[PDB]
Each structure stands twice: as structure tokens, then as C-alpha cells.
Amino acid sequence: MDKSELVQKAKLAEQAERYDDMAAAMKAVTEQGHELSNEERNLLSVAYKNVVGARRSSWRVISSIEQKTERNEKKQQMGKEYREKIEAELQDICNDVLELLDKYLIPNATQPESKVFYLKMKGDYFRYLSEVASGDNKQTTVSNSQQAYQEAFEISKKEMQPTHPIRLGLALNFSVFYYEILNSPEKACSLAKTAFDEAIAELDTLNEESYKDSTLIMQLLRDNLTLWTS
Amino acid sequence: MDKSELVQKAKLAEQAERYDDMAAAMKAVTEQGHELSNEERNLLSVAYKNVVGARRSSWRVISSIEQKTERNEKKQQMGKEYREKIEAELQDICNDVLELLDKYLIPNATQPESKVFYLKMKGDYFRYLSEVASGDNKQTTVSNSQQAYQEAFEISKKEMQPTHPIRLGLALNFSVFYYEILNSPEKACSLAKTAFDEAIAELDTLNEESYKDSTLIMQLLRDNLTLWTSEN
Amino acid sequence: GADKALADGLVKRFGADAEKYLGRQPGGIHSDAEVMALGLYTGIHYADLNRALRQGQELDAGQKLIDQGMSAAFEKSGQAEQVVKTFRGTRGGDAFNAVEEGKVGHDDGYLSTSLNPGVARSFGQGTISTVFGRSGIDVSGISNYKNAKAILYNKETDMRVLLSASDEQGVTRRVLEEAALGELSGHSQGLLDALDLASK
Ligand SMILES: NC(=O)c1ccc[n+]([C@@H]2C[C@H](COP(=O)(O)OP(=O)(O)OC[C@H]3O[C@@H](n4cnc5c(N)ncnc54)[C@H](O)[C@@H]3O)[C@@H](O)[C@H]2O)c1
């Protein structure tokens, strides 16, 4: 199918709140081999965010049930089989987007802003895999998440303003990775503190069209430091 | 597969907000041919309500888009193709529940309460088909909705209290059918008025288990009546 | 003890009027002072006591004893295991006229209700209410004119108005619930959601 045809189907599916349709439309647009516009990148991103986000929520609910309801071993098996069905779905989602990233998105990203975005995204979906993984498989994904986040971090610190919403958003998601996935309040607080401190030192770099985007992520990083050091 | 296994998977699916899984679990429980308990009936009902309800909402959104953007012929061909994909999903969901009703639910319904429930349900899903249908198929889906609602209405008026939540819920859904599907404010207001009047005449018939269920449906009945009849 | 004083005060104050209720409840949940106080109220003292209570007047010596015997009976009794459905009819005025649906209010006097609907219409056709509660006291064994089979609710007992409607005859039809029962009470688990109601 045509590029503008699938993009309109994705814009429609979004309005209809049919994100699995929205993601499949944008998967085909990506799988063609041509670099995505800022509009198409954001459509692919919000589509998979909701596709994966729904499975993450469902996983956090069934996992929370398994703990609080420990009696019938047949009930615990039903809970495990269902958690694992969602895990299978979660794994397949992240694989499909990590596949689109390595094969199409990251190689065709010309400008650094786009390269940071897709590398932060690679860190995100590897982190989503880490939440459900265990043992040796968990170790592989946590290391891949940290690497992809660090790669983007080094590119952003050299080719982007300290108040860039993609740089700040990366700082928030990377610090949360250290806090949730590596259980390091110290490393999480250090990333958030430095990122916030560097952004308030250079508020002059804010754009008059995307300053509210930056101040919002600068509030989420400020609320986390006060929450974590309480 | 076991009955209590699928029921637990459906209770899990409900918590996880995975209603397509919830409906599929309860579809299998129903296809076992054994009469559903009050718990199992409600699990099958909330499962399909959400499965169909999501497609109804998505259909009302894409249809609202088609109107406000009556421009490019390839853009309308995208909107129509997508509306029709959702329509096909709707017709497939409805058919599946109408199939469970005629083949398993309505024939195994012993007590009149559960019979009125399944007949109101048959009226509901035929009404959902009517919202997307056109022409000859519309005429048939509409007549089938009215018949199934009327069947349930006659059984409820004879074997159920005027305050029964299933009888009141039927009155609300049947009156809304007349208002939305047959565009009859007069027939809708008459059904709602009589049902509300008969329920406030016999508030003594309220059950100590479902009295708040009854008072809530009585408020929706009344609120519709004041909405349908009040001028600004 | 404080009860023995009251039981003595009540027969001192009301003589044979008080004494006629002694042993009327051989179940024995309530003391002689409580049984006599509820008796005195239910039989005839409801009129003057509820008037003093609703008007915020000083209770005379005799009114104070009945009120303190009833308050003590409600402290003892507390909440029951099952929810009860009672009925109530009023002529000219009602405590819950001033309460909008979903909101809670109370009567400053005691709320008399009946286990029989037909008995309630015989007390009034201004407003006929259906009550659901657990903290009421059954006095049908103490005083039972009209075979009213009365369940009394304590003074200032907070009730939530679940429905406040009117008849084509002009009778207000109310559904009250003891506000202490909660939000979960009166709902058959999963039913309302299963009913797939045609409203957003
Ligand atoms: N009304 C009933 O439905 C009912 C049911 C069962 C037993 N009883 C008994 C009947 C008898 C008296 O009770 P009842 O008639 O209910 O007493 P009441 O004191 O509560 O009512 C007398 C009349 O006063 C009016 N009134 C009531 N409440 C208010 C208020 N809050 N503000 C302004 N006016 C008000 C109203 O007109 C009512 O009919 C006792 O023997 C009770 O045991 C009454």
C-alpha cells in the first residue's frame, strides 16, 4: 500500500483509539525503507507506546494478583499462564519495534535529534523487556537498554541544547531505568540532578515554540528528585 | 478445558482490561452447553458489552470524521474502508453473541429472570446491528430487536416486580431503542413513564440486595424523561 | 446501675404508664428502663418528645428520662447482621424534604418505620418512604398499635436519599438508606455493569 494511504489509516485508527491497527499501519510505512518525517515518527511512536503500554499495565495487574492471592495452586497456575500470555505479547511487541529500529529507523536517521530519539526508544523497549525477563535473558536486555540510552546520551550531550525536549525526555527515562531496573537511587538521582542543573543553567537555549515541552519534563525530573531523596 | 479454569481466566482478563480475552473465555464456557450461574452470566455480559462497546465507539468516531471531511475521493475511500472494517468487526461480534443466545443461553434459561435478561440482551445486540445496517438488512435487524425486547417485556410484566433491576434495565434499553432506532420520542417517553410510574407505585417490592441497582436505573429513566420533554 | 436509677425514675414519673411495659420483651436484650422508655415513646410520648427534639426545646424532666432510656437502648442494640426493609408515611412534613438525592440528612427526632407497607400509608400519604438499615430497634413486642410492627431508628440517624420522586397523584416516593451502610450496599455484585445500560 501507498505511504500517504497507511498514514491516513494510522491517523484514523488513532482517533478510533485502535492503536494495534495504528501500529500495524506505521509498521508497514517503516518497513518500506524510507526515512520517517517528524509527523510519521511521532505516529509510529504514540502507536507503539499505547500498544506496549496496554500490555505493561495488564502485566502489572496480573502480577499484583499472583502475589495477593496465594492459596489454590490451580488458581496460581491460571494467573501464571495468563501473565506469560501477556509476557509473550509484550516480548513480540518490543521485538517488532526493536527490529524496526535496527533495520530501518536508526540507520536512516540523518540528523542527531532523530538519532537520539530512536536510540532512547531502543533503550525504552529493552527496558520494557527487562521488566518481564528473568536471569540470563534479563541481564542481556538490561545491558542493551543501558547501552542504547548511553549512546543517545553521548550524542545529545554533544549535538543538542540542555533544554531539548528529546534530551530531557531521555534524561527522565534513563534515570527511571536506573531507579526501577537497576534499583540505584544514587545513579538515578545523579542523572536527574545533572540533567536538571544543566537545563536551568542554560534556559536561554529554550525555543519560543517548544518551551512548555521542556519546562514540563523539567518538572517531572524535579518532582522525582524530591520524591526519591525524601 | 475446565469450566472453573476459563471462568478464572475471564475474571483475570477483566482485571487486566483485556475484554477480547474475557469474551473468548466466556464464549467457550457457554459452548459447553451447561446453564450459566448468575456470576457466569454477568461475566459473559460485561465481556461482550466492552468488546462490542469499543467497536460502537470507534464506529461513531470514524462516521463523525467522514461527515466533517467530505472532500478528497481517496480520503473518503480510506474513511469508508476503515468504517466498514469496524462494521465487519461489529457484525462478527454481534452474530457470535446472538448465536450464543439462540443456541445456548435462551433455551437453557429455566427461571423467568434469566430469560428476560437473555431476551433483553438479544434486543440489545440486534439494536447494535441496526445502528450500522442499511436498507433491507436494517428493517430486519430493527424488527428482530423490537420483537426480542417485547418478548422480554411481556415475560417481565407477568413474572417480575416493577422494581426488578432486570425489568427496569429492559425498560431503559427498550425506550432508548424507540428514541434512537425508531426516532419516536412519544413511544420512548410512554415506555419510560409507565415503567417509572409502576416502579414508584411499588417501592415496597425493592430487594435488600439490589435496591441501589433499582434506584439508579429509576434515576436514568426519570432523567431521560425530563431530557426528552424539557424545553430551554 | 445508671439504668437502675432510670428504671426507678421512670416508674416514679409515669407510674402504671411506665410499669405496663415491664417484661413485654422476654427476649431480654434491653433492660427494664430501656423497655419502659421505648414503650412510653411508641405508645404515645412520640408526639411531645419528637416535637421538643425537632424544635430544639429543653426537654422536661419526664422527656429526659424517655430520651435517655432510648439513647441507651440504641447504644446496646447497635448494627444488626442483616439489612432490613421498613416503610414510613408522613402527612404534612418530612425530615428528608430538605435532602437532595445522593446527599445525606437526618430527622432531629426518632424515625418510626413499619415492616408492613399498608401500615405506613395509614400514617400518611404526603410522603411514603422505603428505608434500608441495620441500626433500628424492633419495638413490636413492647408497643404495637395497628400491628405496625415498628422498627425505630435513633434520633439524628443519618440517612442517604437514594431516590426522591413524585406520583401522578402528588405523593412523594422516597428511598432512604442508613448512610453508615456504605456505597457497596444495595448493589448486587456485577449486575448493573452486566445490564449494559443505554447511557454514557
Ligand atoms: N409513620 C409511620 O409510617 C409509622 C410506621 C410504623 C409505626 N409508627 C408508629 C406510629 C406512632 C407515631 O409515629 P409517626 O406518625 O411516624 O411520628 P412523627 O412524629 O415522626 O410524625 C407525625 C407527623 O408529623 C410530621 N413530621 C414528621 N417528621 C417531621 C419533621 N422531621 N419535620 C416537620 N414535620 C415532621 C408529619 O406530618 C408526620 O406525619 C408511633 O406509635 C410509632 O411507633 C409510624
Short mmCIF file of C-alpha atoms and ligand atoms in Angstrom, two decimals, chain C residues 38-39 41-44 46-48 50-51 54 87-97 106-117 119-125 127 129 139 143-152, ligand 1:
data_model
loop_
_atom_site.label_atom_id
_atom_site.label_comp_id
_atom_site.label_asym_id
_atom_site.label_seq_id
_atom_site.Cartn_x
_atom_site.Cartn_y
_atom_site.Cartn_z
CA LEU C 38 -39.36 2.73 74.21
CA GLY C 39 -42.82 1.66 75.39
CA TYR C 41 -42.44 6.68 73.36
CA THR C 42 -44.11 4.20 70.93
CA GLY C 43 -47.42 4.17 72.76
CA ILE C 44 -47.99 8.00 72.92
CA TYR C 46 -43.55 10.20 70.41
CA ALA C 47 -45.72 13.29 69.77
CA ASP C 48 -44.42 15.58 72.58
CA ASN C 50 -40.29 14.49 68.76
CA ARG C 51 -41.87 17.99 68.87
CA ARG C 54 -37.36 18.87 66.26
CA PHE C 87 -41.71 1.66 55.40
CA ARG C 88 -42.79 5.10 56.63
CA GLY C 89 -45.58 7.56 55.83
CA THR C 90 -45.84 11.26 56.74
CA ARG C 91 -48.72 13.75 56.24
CA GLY C 92 -47.62 17.44 56.13
CA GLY C 93 -43.88 17.33 56.69
CA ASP C 94 -40.82 15.17 56.39
CA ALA C 95 -37.19 15.45 57.51
CA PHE C 96 -35.83 14.41 54.12
CA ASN C 97 -37.66 17.05 52.07
CA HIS C 106 -31.38 13.26 59.36
CA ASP C 107 -34.52 13.69 61.48
CA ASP C 108 -33.83 15.52 64.79
CA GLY C 109 -36.49 13.27 66.46
CA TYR C 110 -36.85 9.48 66.17
CA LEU C 111 -37.76 7.88 62.88
CA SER C 112 -40.68 5.34 63.16
CA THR C 113 -40.86 2.76 60.38
CA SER C 114 -43.04 -0.33 59.75
CA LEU C 115 -42.34 -3.84 58.46
CA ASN C 116 -45.76 -3.65 56.62
CA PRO C 117 -46.23 -1.22 53.65
CA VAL C 119 -49.44 0.14 57.79
CA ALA C 120 -47.24 3.11 56.61
CA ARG C 121 -49.93 4.58 54.19
CA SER C 122 -52.29 4.62 57.18
CA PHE C 123 -49.91 7.15 58.93
CA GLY C 124 -49.55 9.42 55.89
CA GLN C 125 -49.88 9.94 52.13
CA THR C 127 -44.60 11.24 51.53
CA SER C 129 -40.55 6.19 52.09
CA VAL C 139 -40.48 -2.49 69.40
CA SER C 143 -45.97 -1.45 71.80
CA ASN C 144 -47.78 -2.47 68.55
CA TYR C 145 -50.98 -0.47 67.83
CA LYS C 146 -52.33 -1.09 64.25
CA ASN C 147 -49.90 -4.15 64.33
CA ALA C 148 -47.50 -1.58 62.89
CA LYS C 149 -44.51 -3.95 63.60
CA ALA C 150 -42.29 -0.89 64.09
CA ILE C 151 -38.51 -0.61 63.70
CA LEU C 152 -37.36 2.68 65.28
N1 LIG D 1 -45.33 6.95 60.03
C1 LIG D 1 -45.16 5.67 60.01
O1 LIG D 1 -45.04 5.24 58.93
C2 LIG D 1 -45.13 4.78 61.15
C3 LIG D 1 -44.85 3.39 60.96
C4 LIG D 1 -44.75 2.45 61.99
C5 LIG D 1 -45.03 2.82 63.29
N2 LIG D 1 -45.34 4.15 63.54
C6 LIG D 1 -45.71 4.47 64.92
C7 LIG D 1 -46.78 5.44 64.89
C8 LIG D 1 -46.54 6.33 66.02
C9 LIG D 1 -46.01 7.75 65.58
O2 LIG D 1 -45.04 7.80 64.59
P1 LIG D 1 -45.12 8.86 63.37
O3 LIG D 1 -46.57 9.20 62.93
O4 LIG D 1 -44.32 8.19 62.32
O5 LIG D 1 -44.42 10.12 64.04
P2 LIG D 1 -43.81 11.52 63.65
O6 LIG D 1 -43.53 12.32 64.82
O7 LIG D 1 -42.41 11.25 63.09
O8 LIG D 1 -44.85 12.15 62.64
C10 LIG D 1 -46.09 12.84 62.86
C11 LIG D 1 -46.34 13.83 61.68
O9 LIG D 1 -45.51 14.96 61.83
C12 LIG D 1 -44.88 15.37 60.63
N3 LIG D 1 -43.37 15.26 60.62
C13 LIG D 1 -42.63 14.16 60.70
N4 LIG D 1 -41.35 14.43 60.72
C14 LIG D 1 -41.23 15.73 60.59
C15 LIG D 1 -40.11 16.54 60.52
N5 LIG D 1 -38.85 15.97 60.61
N6 LIG D 1 -40.29 17.89 60.35
C16 LIG D 1 -41.61 18.56 60.24
N7 LIG D 1 -42.73 17.61 60.38
C17 LIG D 1 -42.50 16.27 60.52
C18 LIG D 1 -45.60 14.59 59.58
O10 LIG D 1 -46.69 15.32 59.28
C19 LIG D 1 -45.90 13.29 60.30
O11 LIG D 1 -46.94 12.66 59.71
C20 LIG D 1 -45.66 5.56 66.95
O12 LIG D 1 -46.67 4.72 67.60
C21 LIG D 1 -44.78 4.80 66.00
O13 LIG D 1 -44.35 3.55 66.61
C22 LIG D 1 -45.34 5.12 62.47
#
